[PDB]
Design a protein around this ligand. Structure first.
Ligand code: NA
Lengths: 364, 365
């Protein structure tokens, strides 16, 4: 019976993964072991308790005995531990959320509705590192999967409207708190433009409104920089997109992906405006048809107001496995370009779900 | 002897921002203002308007007729009621308007004078009397990449907007502030983070707890990728406005397509825009910044690094100002001739009030 170890389970991706596993009976045929850095040797509270004591995340001996380890811990942890394990002779499967290993020749990026047949080929060829892609790539590729499978996409501009969850649980707490504080200081009786001014000036004071995590106040704001600077002009968040998509599809012919990644005051759903150039001209009805058949999670939202405002939003989509996609229209830019807008949940299809699903492929 | 100028719309947001911009610029100096209203007529308004006398009636066709120039921030319902009655009643004065009603008539001239000043003058000169402010997205975009448009270097533009609630009016903004207030009250710090998100999320959907008629759905912790009326092309009216207005402002021989999506976000007064621009010629990224940086005095380039981007290329930074901030200027993987950038500017000023104020000045001269 497979000994599977879990690192990262305490955080958001990790809880969402746990919850998705409980719901799917994914613990049934494995011997879980739960790793930690805090109450080690202690019995955790919750269901995890039935698997016994928490072992040490940094103990290399304990990690070594697992057949499969699954980390939502982060890149600082993967950089600091993964190499020690291979250096120390461990030949088990490393399933990881962090971006560190994404691009190594030994790694396979996992998004099984697009590259199942490749995950299998990798496991089969004695490959052992299976890494979740960046949330933007996962969520996009799933939305237009029915075009990508037919190799109909020449390139993709994406402009993202990214939620705070991708940044972790303290960033979200911060966002909620910024918004709380500003809501207190805001006075209904004051003139509307003066209120806006008052919030605006308050939002800038780092000693009143905590902004160390979001660097600046995110509430009533936008932040058009995610991650680290690249010499090309992109953030790291943005450069990911093209290379990962092509690694997932294992393209003969590179499909360029570009645009800008913007943090907005949403909580767990990433949204994206896509401008997609096709390899051939297609009617708009052919495009919807194909999109609608990409997988079972794609959820087409018809291009009208009532349905767009009700279903093509973070409000509507958060918590769910739906890849909503709408505003599907032809473009004035060129006869072969179309536009659409999509929304999906960062924590699930964006982080946790692909990991859970590849685990299942590895264990059976 | 002096120009008699009447003001409709002055109580609302665009209108206050206009008043403020006029005080600051001494734009009342050489005109006889008259302030029109639809409620407290005959009343002495409070504030500086006091010095120009009593409020006249917005709907009185006689009183309006005596003004040499009328300037409306009132709206399209009002322009619809009243503008035709004035022309029907013989009045040949200048109608400067914010509303979109008249934007595309052959008789109308769209105003954005850092780009089409020469044309405003030609229009006034040719006995044209209707001067209309363009949609905020067009005004703000065109100004940001003005230095490329003047050289006719732009083949097309994809814009994805992140539009603030102010463009929807003062009650919509109040609504947004209030949604956020109420949700903040129910939110509990001690509860588990994913449960809090859930609680807000479910509360946001109850129209009897969280008012959402003005924004149709809750905008707080949300976004709304539909602005305005459905078009048969697939666009919203907000989105179709872009291409036709830009081409009217530039009076192009060759249409420059503008497309993308317009999205409402929980900002208050600054519209942001991610632009993907295809050029007619390949240009280095330094040539592109250079040109952009010389489009006009308001264009403010923000160097493509984190500290500066987060501090200056944002609604927080930009709201209240005349700066057209533009940054994240980079070359693109899509094509050797495409570049990307992100811009931010204030909806109420360059987006609404400022162009109007400035064309008034061209007419009074
Ligand atoms: Na600068």
């Amino acid at each position: 019976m497979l000994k599977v170890g879990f690192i990262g389970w305490r955080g958001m991706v990790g809880s969402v993964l746990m919850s998705r596993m409980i719901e799917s009976k994914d613990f049934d045929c494995i011997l879980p072991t739960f790793f930690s850095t805090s109450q080690v040797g202690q019995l955790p509270t919750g269901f995890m308790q039935q698997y016994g004591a928490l072992q040490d995340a940094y103990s290399i001996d304990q990690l070594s005995s697992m057949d499969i380890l699954l980390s939502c811990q982060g890149g600082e942890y993967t950089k600091e531990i993964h190499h020690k394990l291979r250096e120390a002779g461990w030949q088990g499967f490393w399933i990881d959320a962090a971006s560190t290993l994404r691009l190594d020749k030994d790694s396979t990026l996992v998004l099984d509705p697009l590259n199942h047949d490749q995950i299998i080929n990798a496991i089969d060829n004695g490959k052992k590192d299976f890494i979740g892609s960046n949330c933007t790539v996962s969520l996009m590729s799933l939305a237009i999967a029915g075009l990508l499978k037919e190799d109909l996409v020449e390139w993709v501009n994406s402009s993202t409207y990214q939620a705070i969850s991708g940044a972790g649980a303290a960033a979200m707490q911060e966002l909620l708190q910024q918004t709380s504080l500003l809501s207190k200081i805001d006075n209904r009786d004051e003139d509307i433009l003066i209120r806006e001014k008052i919030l605006r000036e308050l939002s800038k004071d780092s000693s009143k409104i905590p902004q160390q995590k979001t660097v600046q106040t995110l509430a009533y704001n936008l932040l058009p920089w995610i991650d680290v600077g690249m010499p090309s002009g992109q953030t790291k968040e943005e450069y990911k997109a093209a290379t990962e998509l092509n690694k997932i599809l294992d393209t003969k012919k590179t499909i360029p992906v570009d645009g800008i990644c913007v943090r907005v005051p949403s909580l767990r759903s990433h949204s994206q405006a896509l401008t997609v150039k096709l390899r051939q001209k297609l009617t708009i009805e052919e495009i919807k048809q194909k999109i609608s058949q990409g997988n079972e999670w794609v959820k087409v939202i018809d291009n009208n107001k009532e349905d767009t405002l009700k279903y093509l939003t973070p409000q509507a989509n958060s918590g769910t496995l739906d890849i909503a996609i709408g505003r599907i229209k032809s473009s004035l830019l060129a006869d072969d370009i179309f536009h659409c807008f999509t929304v999906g949940d960062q924590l699930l299809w964006g982080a946790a779900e692909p990991l859970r699903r590849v685990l299942n492929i590895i264990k059976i």
